[PDB]
Amino acid sequence: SKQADAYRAISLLLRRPPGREAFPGDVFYLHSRLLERCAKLSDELGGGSMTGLPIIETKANDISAFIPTNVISITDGQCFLESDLFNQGVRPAINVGVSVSRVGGAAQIKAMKEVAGSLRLDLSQYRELEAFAAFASDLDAASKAQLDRGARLVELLKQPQYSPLAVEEQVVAIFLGTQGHLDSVPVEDVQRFESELLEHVKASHSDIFDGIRETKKLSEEAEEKLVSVINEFKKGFXXXXXXXXXXX
Amino acid sequence: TLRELRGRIRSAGSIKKITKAQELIATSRIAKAQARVEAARPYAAEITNMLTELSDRGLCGAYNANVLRRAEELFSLLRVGRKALGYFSFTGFSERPTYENAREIADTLVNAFMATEFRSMLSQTARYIATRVYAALLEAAASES
Amino acid sequence: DLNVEIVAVERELWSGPATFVFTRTTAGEIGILPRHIPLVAQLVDDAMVRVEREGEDDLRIAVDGGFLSVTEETVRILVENAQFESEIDADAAKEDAASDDERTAAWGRARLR
Amino acid sequence: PAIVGDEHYRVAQEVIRILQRYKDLQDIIAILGIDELSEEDKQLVNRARRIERFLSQNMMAAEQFTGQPGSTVPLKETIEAFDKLTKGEFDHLPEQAFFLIGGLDDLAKKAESL
Amino acid sequence: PAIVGDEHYRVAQEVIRILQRYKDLQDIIAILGIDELSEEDKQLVNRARRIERFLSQNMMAAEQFTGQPGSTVPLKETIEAFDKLTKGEFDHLPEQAFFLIGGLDDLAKKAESL
Amino acid sequence: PAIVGDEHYRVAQEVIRILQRYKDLQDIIAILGIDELSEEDKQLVNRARRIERFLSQNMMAAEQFTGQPGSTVPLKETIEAFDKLTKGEFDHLPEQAFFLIGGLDDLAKKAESL
């Protein structure tokens, strides 16, 4: 955004004719040559890579603006951050509906592809339903379960600053939520449940993490192992708010 | 200014979902209302056999307006619910009301003596006494939803 | 046999053909069996027994209400607040015997136990 | 959490969460009102409004404007105050009690007068 | 009040007050309607709508457009008419009675036909 | 009707009508279900679902994806197929019979296997 503004200054000083938003004609061309150089080479030319994470600063969440639209049309997907979501507590504040990955499943290990295949679908249904959530026990059973599930999934997606998780830790955390292992636990205690669970698995059940690292998939053995580990932990876990609950 | 227009789009957009939600929540309560009336009807029928042998919430269109209009007209010619009590002056009845709700009021009305018809979703036209009060309450609860 | 309809004001419970039925009324303890005279009677705060062809005769509560009978083989029972033993337990009736209006309902629930 | 400690960070964000939700419901409250909101939302709106008014404070420079003298509130007083507001210990007090006050003592003193 | 007298000024502003409040409630009426408004507001909206339609008038030039001939209303008739409307003497009459009429006699004459 | 004849136009719009009504009832079906719908609506929903699945077809390019080879359906076969579906001649057949098929012969052949 600032590099574009810098080039705008140069062009205007050189007395090059301005266009939309006082930018020169080759402001798109500026970003095009830059980003395209980022690529994945063939096996013949070594097979090296060069991943790009360009940034654009929108004004009042204006995606429609000239410079944003230019870079959006170049890049291979976007991760739109919102102010409303950030302030509301969703951090990182990635808008799920608008944000996209053009590569998609190709840039995912089989473990993540399976667990987070229909995570996107569940949360798309949740946002549609969300309106109804306020009116508790006025709905049927199916929709109620989806809201309770969806609300807990949001808490898993929340992540503190400067705390990257390993891929094996992520798959387990998502597998927990998607399968419905957090349904018994309150929504506010999901974040602490996740942290303490990973600590337990790291210490005792490292073989499960090791399995995911090597195989790049979750085995039927590992699934049954996790279920037992979760159930045992639930009993131990002291719920912060109100009384505790394991299973029903 | 865009700032204003963008906010209005957000406003109307949000309100749409709220209205659409309460639309379908009312669609649920009509089904439970009618289902409750199906149980009540054969009971009153059995009671009558013997005797022969011997709103709080708003957002309900012109539900209150129609009832109060007929009431005011009938009272003028001849001579329950926070909304109604408010109009007459110038409660807390559940959406699916039980008998315990309309037991005390029914008894007091009976002791005093001793001492909205449902057609369609769109169309609503405005011991034994206790059942009559309740039989009306369900039909009224249906008409409201 | 007679088609004994146990109905509550909120919902219809049962309508099965029982052999006989026993309950306490204001007049006395009546036992309505097939080919009975058309009669009208109020019920008192006490239990009643329903006996079906096969299986054990279940017993149920009736705080208020009455009892119906006609020339046609159709017994009907109207109760304001009925309760079936199944999984009531509680024995609150005994502790709720302090209040007179609640002792009324209690006396009905107590005798069933 | 590194600089200003976990408690301060927790309270700060929790206040922002409440004020954010209040701002989101402005559009719905404008048409329908408070009645259509749930029991939880009703309380959040009540707290949010009280938090907004508590954030107001007397300025030492603004004697000519307001009339009353300014007030300085230490960090410990600030943290404790918003802690009690978020928990909902001052739900009984009126909205006017929170308007243009420094310390917690001045809140309770003005509450009695009203 | 100097030129056109106190009465005319009073009625003129009172009409504007009613129409202004009606315009303010347009946003709320668009979604919810008249039902959610209070007893006082309900009456104001009813009067406002009737005032809007009474302001409509047949034009002498517009014979080819409308069909009916035009009507000229003196100042005294105008003042008296809006006086009665503001007080609420013609609350019983329908909305169609006010549409495209000059004098008060023509209002009552069209009221009977409907 | 001018370019493509009256029959094609009639069938095309009639299919759209059924699918449109199905989409409208999605909100009601989500909460209550099929039970609350009328006898006519119940049948329309059944037909609509079967029409949605019949619109699915095997692609020649998609051999690696699906497994089975692609199918090409002439115009006459298309018109006749949706004609019979709208009339309700294939009400007896299951939902799985309509999934990923070209011609009408392949529908009946898969129906027997299930």
Tab-separated table of C-alpha atoms in Angstrom, chain E residues 53-111:
chain	number	residue	atom	x	y	z
E	53	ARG	CA	-53.576	14.183	1.015
E	54	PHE	CA	-55.595	17.354	1.796
E	55	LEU	CA	-52.641	19.488	0.568
E	56	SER	CA	-53.332	17.905	-2.865
E	57	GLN	CA	-55.683	20.062	-4.979
E	58	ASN	CA	-57.329	20.171	-8.435
E	59	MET	CA	-55.586	22.532	-10.906
E	60	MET	CA	-57.476	24.662	-13.483
E	61	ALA	CA	-54.689	24.040	-16.047
E	62	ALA	CA	-54.841	20.270	-15.351
E	63	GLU	CA	-58.206	19.425	-16.967
E	64	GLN	CA	-56.571	17.251	-19.672
E	65	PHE	CA	-54.471	15.439	-17.016
E	66	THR	CA	-56.940	14.742	-14.168
E	67	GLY	CA	-60.339	15.210	-15.873
E	68	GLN	CA	-62.208	17.194	-13.200
E	69	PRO	CA	-62.096	21.046	-13.273
E	70	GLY	CA	-59.804	23.058	-10.947
E	71	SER	CA	-60.773	24.645	-7.614
E	72	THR	CA	-59.678	27.921	-5.945
E	73	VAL	CA	-59.645	28.045	-2.113
E	74	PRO	CA	-59.629	31.470	-0.335
E	75	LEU	CA	-57.289	32.206	2.619
E	76	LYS	CA	-60.101	32.041	5.229
E	77	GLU	CA	-61.191	28.584	3.963
E	78	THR	CA	-57.547	27.377	4.038
E	79	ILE	CA	-56.861	28.546	7.630
E	80	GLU	CA	-60.169	27.123	8.972
E	81	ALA	CA	-59.628	23.770	7.180
E	82	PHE	CA	-56.150	23.044	8.633
E	83	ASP	CA	-57.364	24.359	12.033
E	84	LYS	CA	-60.037	21.608	12.137
E	85	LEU	CA	-57.552	18.954	10.881
E	86	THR	CA	-54.958	19.771	13.598
E	87	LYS	CA	-57.637	19.718	16.351
E	88	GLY	CA	-58.826	16.350	14.945
E	89	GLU	CA	-62.448	17.104	14.009
E	90	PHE	CA	-62.162	15.030	10.785
E	91	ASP	CA	-60.664	11.862	12.343
E	92	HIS	CA	-63.781	9.826	11.398
E	93	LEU	CA	-63.543	10.626	7.647
E	94	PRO	CA	-61.573	8.247	5.338
E	95	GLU	CA	-58.204	8.995	3.659
E	96	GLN	CA	-59.751	9.060	0.144
E	97	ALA	CA	-62.094	11.933	1.165
E	98	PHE	CA	-59.103	14.323	1.506
E	99	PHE	CA	-57.557	13.366	-1.884
E	100	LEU	CA	-57.755	16.034	-4.636
E	101	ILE	CA	-60.386	18.418	-3.177
E	102	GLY	CA	-60.692	22.217	-2.744
E	103	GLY	CA	-63.350	23.352	-0.242
E	104	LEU	CA	-64.606	21.653	2.945
E	105	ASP	CA	-68.066	21.081	1.382
E	106	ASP	CA	-66.496	18.888	-1.345
E	107	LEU	CA	-64.775	16.761	1.365
E	108	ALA	CA	-68.110	15.944	3.064
E	109	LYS	CA	-69.858	15.396	-0.314
E	110	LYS	CA	-67.239	12.822	-1.440
E	111	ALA	CA	-67.291	11.200	2.048
